[PDB]
Design a protein around this ligand. Structure first.
Ligand SMILES: NC(=[NH2+])NCCC[C@H](N)C(=O)O
Ligand SMILES: CC(C)C[C@H](N)C(=O)O
Length: 109
Protein backbone atom coordinates (compact mmCIF):
# COMPACT_ATOMS: atom_id res chain seq x y z
CA UNK A 1 0.00 0.00 0.00
CA UNK A 2 1.00 3.65 0.23
CA UNK A 3 2.85 3.07 3.53
CA UNK A 4 4.78 -0.06 2.60
CA UNK A 5 4.75 -3.47 1.00
CA UNK A 6 1.85 -5.88 1.46
CA UNK A 7 2.36 -9.65 1.44
CA UNK A 8 0.40 -12.91 1.30
CA UNK A 9 1.88 -15.53 3.62
CA UNK A 10 0.84 -19.14 3.16
CA UNK A 11 2.11 -21.57 5.79
CA UNK A 12 2.35 -25.20 4.72
CA UNK A 13 3.22 -28.07 7.02
CA UNK A 14 3.61 -31.41 5.31
CA UNK A 15 4.67 -34.97 6.12
CA UNK A 16 6.95 -36.43 3.41
CA UNK A 17 7.43 -40.22 3.31
CA UNK A 18 9.76 -41.37 0.51
CA UNK A 19 11.10 -44.70 -0.65
CA UNK A 20 14.71 -45.70 -0.09
CA UNK A 21 15.54 -45.42 -3.80
CA UNK A 22 14.37 -41.84 -4.32
CA UNK A 23 14.91 -38.37 -2.96
CA UNK A 24 12.36 -36.04 -1.41
CA UNK A 25 12.48 -34.34 -4.79
CA UNK A 26 13.76 -30.85 -3.94
CA UNK A 27 16.96 -28.80 -3.86
CA UNK A 28 17.63 -26.75 -0.74
CA UNK A 29 19.65 -23.55 -0.96
CA UNK A 30 20.77 -20.97 1.57
CA UNK A 31 19.83 -17.37 0.81
CA UNK A 32 22.66 -16.05 3.00
CA UNK A 33 25.47 -17.32 5.16
CA UNK A 34 24.87 -17.97 8.83
CA UNK A 35 27.57 -16.39 10.97
CA UNK A 36 27.79 -16.58 14.76
CA UNK A 37 28.70 -12.85 14.69
CA UNK A 38 25.07 -11.77 14.32
CA UNK A 39 21.73 -13.55 14.25
CA UNK A 40 19.70 -13.62 11.07
CA UNK A 41 16.52 -11.67 11.71
CA UNK A 42 13.42 -12.75 9.77
CA UNK A 43 11.21 -10.28 7.94
CA UNK A 44 8.04 -10.88 5.89
CA UNK A 45 10.02 -10.58 2.63
CA UNK A 46 12.88 -12.81 3.88
CA UNK A 47 11.51 -15.19 6.54
CA UNK A 48 14.30 -17.82 6.71
CA UNK A 49 17.85 -18.60 5.60
CA UNK A 50 17.00 -21.81 3.64
CA UNK A 51 14.58 -22.09 0.74
CA UNK A 52 13.46 -24.53 -1.95
CA UNK A 53 15.48 -23.58 -5.01
CA UNK A 54 13.55 -26.15 -7.05
CA UNK A 55 10.99 -28.90 -6.49
CA UNK A 56 10.80 -31.97 -8.78
CA UNK A 57 7.42 -31.97 -10.47
CA UNK A 58 5.66 -35.20 -9.52
CA UNK A 59 8.12 -36.00 -6.73
CA UNK A 60 7.37 -36.58 -3.09
CA UNK A 61 7.69 -32.97 -1.95
CA UNK A 62 5.73 -31.78 -4.97
CA UNK A 63 2.80 -34.12 -4.33
CA UNK A 64 2.58 -32.97 -0.70
CA UNK A 65 2.39 -29.33 -1.79
CA UNK A 66 5.90 -27.92 -1.55
CA UNK A 67 6.88 -25.49 -4.28
CA UNK A 68 9.97 -23.73 -5.57
CA UNK A 69 10.65 -20.59 -3.56
CA UNK A 70 9.17 -21.91 -0.28
CA UNK A 71 11.15 -20.88 2.82
CA UNK A 72 11.94 -23.54 5.46
CA UNK A 73 10.70 -22.70 8.95
CA UNK A 74 10.81 -26.05 10.79
CA UNK A 75 12.27 -29.52 10.27
CA UNK A 76 10.99 -32.39 12.41
CA UNK A 77 9.85 -30.09 15.21
CA UNK A 78 13.00 -27.91 15.21
CA UNK A 79 13.11 -24.29 14.11
CA UNK A 80 15.51 -23.72 11.20
CA UNK A 81 14.75 -20.07 10.40
CA UNK A 82 18.19 -18.92 11.60
CA UNK A 83 20.19 -22.10 10.88
CA UNK A 84 22.94 -22.50 8.30
CA UNK A 85 22.74 -24.75 5.27
CA UNK A 86 24.87 -27.79 6.21
CA UNK A 87 23.23 -28.05 9.62
CA UNK A 88 19.77 -27.99 8.02
CA UNK A 89 20.88 -30.62 5.49
CA UNK A 90 22.03 -32.81 8.41
CA UNK A 91 18.72 -32.34 10.27
CA UNK A 92 16.80 -33.43 7.18
CA UNK A 93 19.06 -36.48 6.67
CA UNK A 94 18.62 -37.45 10.32
CA UNK A 95 15.03 -38.49 9.52
CA UNK A 96 15.81 -41.08 6.82
CA UNK A 97 12.72 -41.65 4.67
CA UNK A 98 10.43 -39.41 6.77
CA UNK A 99 10.56 -35.59 6.80
CA UNK A 100 8.11 -33.28 8.60
CA UNK A 101 8.62 -29.74 7.44
CA UNK A 102 6.87 -26.40 7.81
CA UNK A 103 7.46 -23.84 5.06
CA UNK A 104 6.06 -20.44 4.14
CA UNK A 105 5.27 -19.12 0.69
CA UNK A 106 5.53 -15.32 0.41
CA UNK A 107 3.99 -13.22 -2.39
CA UNK A 108 3.75 -9.42 -2.68
CA UNK A 109 0.11 -8.40 -3.42
N1 LIG B 1 16.91 -31.93 -8.68
C1 LIG B 1 17.17 -33.00 -7.94
N2 LIG B 1 16.17 -33.62 -7.33
N3 LIG B 1 18.42 -33.46 -7.83
C2 LIG B 1 18.89 -34.40 -6.82
C3 LIG B 1 18.80 -33.85 -5.41
C4 LIG B 1 19.96 -32.98 -4.95
C5 LIG B 1 19.69 -32.27 -3.63
N4 LIG B 1 20.77 -31.38 -3.23
C6 LIG B 1 19.37 -33.24 -2.49
O1 LIG B 1 20.23 -34.00 -2.07
C1 LIG C 1 17.88 -31.39 1.98
C2 LIG C 1 18.39 -32.36 0.94
C3 LIG C 1 19.39 -33.30 1.57
C4 LIG C 1 17.24 -33.15 0.30
C5 LIG C 1 17.66 -34.00 -0.89
N1 LIG C 1 18.13 -33.16 -1.98
C6 LIG C 1 16.50 -34.90 -1.36
O1 LIG C 1 15.84 -34.52 -2.38
O2 LIG C 1 16.29 -35.98 -0.71
Amino acid sequence: GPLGSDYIIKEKTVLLQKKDSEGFGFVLRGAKAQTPIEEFTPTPAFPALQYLESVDEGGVAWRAGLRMGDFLIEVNGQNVVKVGHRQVVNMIRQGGNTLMVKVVMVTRH
